[PDB]
Structure 1
Amino acid sequence: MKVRASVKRICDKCKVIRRHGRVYVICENPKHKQRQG
């Protein structure tokens, strides 16, 4: 879960959600899993 401020897509599979007031870069790659913060 990469935490950062500039969460962004990495691959096309990088799907984004605003889950519980935060923005999550969810994808198949666990490396791509990002939490904006």
Structure 2
Amino acid sequence: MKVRASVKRICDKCKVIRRHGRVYVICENPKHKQRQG
């Protein structure tokens, strides 16, 4: 998982969700998973 301050979409299948006060980015290609921090 990538943690960073700029969580963006990477591909068209990427999804931007906000669970438990943090922005995540989930996707079927695991290299795309992102938490903000």
1:1-37 per-residue CA deviation (whole Å, 9 max, x = no partner) reads: 1000000000011101001000001000110000000
**How many aligned positions are there?**
37
Moved over 3 A (4+): none
Distance 1:31 1:24 in 2: 13
TM superposition score normalised by structure 2: 0.93
What TM-score comes out, normalization by structure 1 length? 0.93
> 2:36 & 2:2 partners in 1: Cα distance?
8
Structure 2 unpaired stretches of 5+? none
Residue in 2 aligned with 1:28? Answer: 28
Cα root mean square deviation, aligned: 0.5
